């Protein structure tokens, strides 16, 4: 005889809501990956990408690439991401030097010029380019995290089409700025319609989650992307369709506890769903939670099986589990 806390229950997400901005531009990766002349790594080139949509499938399924190594995101998942800026860095090197380009490596390129940050989050993409950049082509030249600089520190290559890693390799680094700010570069994933008051799986501008979305009364400042609770967690989000402010609430959950007289007395049972209203779940509502299968009784007895907030249960006559406000005594 007792009450036993057998499970915890979670109201499920009904459906998935994706709510990115109504931006339509297709990004200029094609301009970087098909530019005629590349830069020398000693003075490496850079390009912003912003306010555009980025289908990485075209790049990742291309046979044009020797490498596609990614250091804080997986290349398979890139279409399911959105972020503030990319920054593409562009240069050419000997193939035997490409392996230095990693988020903590050391070498004649990486330590003395194109150093990656210890926490770099991007993708490094490279290919042999002998049938393009070799001539010899003495113009290509080599020398702290993302540093720039002007018997001198300059050494040339001299690439000839007879040169595998003896060849010129053409290399692009995509440096994703996954800050939490205004997202301007998203994968190709279409935004859905927006659902309210009901449990949903969601993704706003790359901010993933699950919960109930409610129209907030909260005051807003035009730079606000999202808002936080009294402790450091997301309470609210700016809708990127048009700038209303929504709450997020965790989808309703609680402990599930089985009230039982002992199996030598009976095989009948009652179930308490703690900290939930029964409309989220013969039936009774208590300050402890929704109580199902117990029978509510106006009489009061000594507390046989304690439930909470003055409520107790017992097995009584035609028999059933009753639940009642406890008498403290005669």
């Amino acid at each position: 005889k007792g009450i036993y806390q057998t499970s915890n229950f979670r109201v499920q997400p009904t459906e998935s809501i994706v709510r990115f901005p109504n931006i339509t531009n297709l990004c200029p990766f094609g301009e970087v990956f098909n530019a005629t002349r590349f830069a020398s790594v000693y003075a490496w080139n850079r390009k912003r990408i912003s306010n555009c949509v980025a289908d990485y499938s075209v790049l990742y399924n291309s046979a044009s690439f020797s490498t596609f190594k990614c250091y804080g995101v997986s290349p398979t998942k890139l279409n399911d991401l959105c972020f503030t800026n990319v920054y593409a860095d562009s240069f050419v090197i000997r193939g035997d030097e490409v392996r230095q380009i990693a988020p903590g490596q050391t070498g004649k390129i990486a330590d003395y010029n194109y150093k990656l940050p210890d926490d770099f989050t991007g993708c490094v993409i490279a290919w042999n380019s002998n049938n393009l950049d070799s001539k010899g082509n003495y113009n290509y030249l080599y020398r702290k995290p993302f540093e720039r600089d002007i018997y001198f520190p300059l050494q040339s290559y001299g690439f000839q089409p007879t040169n595998v890693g003896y060849q010129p390799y053409r290399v692009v680094v995509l440096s994703f700025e996954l800050l939490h700010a205004p997202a301007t570069v998203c994968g190709p994933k279409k935004s859905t319609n927006l659902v309210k008051n009901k449990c949903v799986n969601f993704n706003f501008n790359g901010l993933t989650g699950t919960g109930v979305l409610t129209e907030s009364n909260k005051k807003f400042l035009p730079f606000q992307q999202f808002g936080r609770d009294i402790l450091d967690i997301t309470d609210a989000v700016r809708d990127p369709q048009t700038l209303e402010i929504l709450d997020i609430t965790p989808c309703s959950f609680g402990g599930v506890s089985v009230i039982t007289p002992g199996t030598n007395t009976s095989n009948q049972v009652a179930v308490l769903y703690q900290d939930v209203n029964c409309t989220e779940v013969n039936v009774f509502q208590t300050r402890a939670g929704c109580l199902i299968g117990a029978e509510h009784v106006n009489n009061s007895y000594e507390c046989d099986i304690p439930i909470g907030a003055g409520i107790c249960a017992s097995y009584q006559t035609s028999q059933s589990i009753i639940a009642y406000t406890m008498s403290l005594g005669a």
């Binding site: 979670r10 995101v73 997986s74 450091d232 967690i233 959950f253 909470g308 406890m326 005669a330």
Partner: protein, 415 residues
């Protein structure tokens, strides 16, 4: 710093008292937290839950450990308050010999029928990822019925309701038993009864003024509420610490990364959060033993100090103890310990024995004293002189047997 006026011939006897109602605040229970440790460590993620099962028993014994605490907060509250098998209540008329308990008995003018002093205590005492709070078994309205039962027994029946069946006795006569408990001979109660009522009532006035004016009067309880809430803030803040992962937002790790990478990152957030949960639960287990040692002490003052009259000096607050009244407070109890304090000395000459008809004599109750001109016998804890007789005193030896004996007449009630 006080050089006490000691010498072989000198005693001080208090001529008057003050019946000081003190206040002792004890925690009795703390917030019945219940943490869904899987939803805390791995909230909404199947991919993370399938890793937490590699770490074996821990989430099961963390639910067991907290349910072990949470079940016993009602054991503490039942052991402290349910020390009576019937709910007593006062009559409508309050003929308590001049004492005014209207401020400590229920006020019917409230939706939860607490006393006026409980309504000060309930004002001066003052997060949703898997963490929850279970309700106390007894509502704070049922705690207000139990304190009214312990109190309506104590006001109409003395200790007897804790020692068998409750027996009524007029309250001015229960206080004559309370004066016998401290060795004060009860004619001192009746010959001063209104003064004792006014000191109880005025001290009750000072209790309200103290709880209205000073927040730190609840300090010991508010500190327990602050420790539990600060341990929850500290436990929740730690959801967001990196522990050496790429990030602390778990669905953003799982959206950014495929499983071969992600199962390395998530082991850092699990082994970080699980260490931060075992830290929390160990802090709660030790803090529950600090509160349970306070629940066993509050149970013990409910037994000895409300249901009885403890003989233990300074246990029932500062002074010689008369009785106590329990008031409930959020997560705790407050005892209004009524202590007799002796308050106004006179210095007397004294002698350990008196010699009369060649034989030595000694008092049956208290001591011999002199105002210098006259010799008296008087009780220990209150000056009331009596001219010495063989009904006040008993015989042994002779004047030569004793150090400090004095030659005086001991009167004969038969003359």
């Amino acid at each position: 710093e006080n050089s006490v006026a000691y010498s072989n011939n000198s005693i001080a006897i208090p001529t008057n008292f003050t019946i000081s109602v003190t206040t002792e605040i004890l925690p009795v229970s703390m917030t019945k937290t219940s943490v869904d440790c899987t939803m805390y460590i791995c909230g909404d993620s199947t991919e993370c839950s399938n890793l937490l099962l590699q770490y074996g028993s821990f989430c099961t014994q963390l639910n067991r450990a907290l349910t072990g605490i949470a079940v016993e907060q009602d054991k503490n509250t039942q052991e402290v308050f349910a020390q009576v098998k019937q709910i007593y209540k006062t009559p409508p008329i309050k003929d308590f010999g001049g004492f005014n308990f209207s401020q400590i008995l229920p006020d019917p003018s409230k939706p939860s029928k607490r006393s006026f002093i409980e309504d000060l205590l309930f004002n001066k005492v003052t997060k949703y990822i898997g963490l929850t709070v279970l309700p106390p078994l007894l509502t704070d309205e049922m705690i207000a019925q139990y304190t009214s039962a312990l109190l309506a027994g104590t006001i109409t029946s003395g200790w007897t309701f804790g020692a068998g069946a409750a027996l009524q006795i007029p309250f001015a006569m229960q206080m004559a038993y309370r004066f016998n408990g401290i060795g004060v001979t009860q004619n001192v109660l009746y010959e001063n009864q209104k003064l004792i009522a006014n000191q109880f009532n005025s001290a009750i006035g000072k209790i309200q003024d103290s709880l209205s004016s000073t927040a730190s009067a609840l300090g010991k309880l508010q500190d327990v509420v602050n420790q539990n809430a600060q341990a929850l803030n500290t436990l929740v803040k730690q959801l967001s610490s990196n522990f050496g992962a790429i990030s602390s937002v778990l669905n953003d790790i799982l959206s950014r990364l495929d499983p071969p990478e992600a199962e390395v990152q998530i082991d850092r957030l699990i082994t970080g959060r699980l260490q931060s949960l075992q830290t929390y639960v160990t802090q709660q287990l030790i803090r529950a033993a600090e509160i349970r040692a306070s629940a066993n002490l509050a149970a013990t003052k409910m037994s000895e100090c409300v249901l009885g009259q403890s003989k233990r000096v300074d246990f029932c607050g500062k002074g010689y103890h008369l009785m106590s009244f329990p008031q409930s407070a959020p997560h705790g109890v407050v005892f209004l310990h009524v202590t007799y304090v002796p308050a106004q000395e006179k210095n007397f000459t004294t002698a350990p024995a008196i010699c009369h008809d060649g034989k030595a004599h000694f008092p049956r109750e208290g001591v011999f004293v002199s105002n210098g001109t006259h010799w008296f016998v008087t009780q220990r804890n209150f000056y009331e002189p009596q001219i010495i007789t063989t009904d006040n005193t008993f015989v042994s030896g002779n004047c030569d047997v004793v150090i400090g004996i004095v030659n005086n007449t001991v009167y004969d009630p038969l003359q």
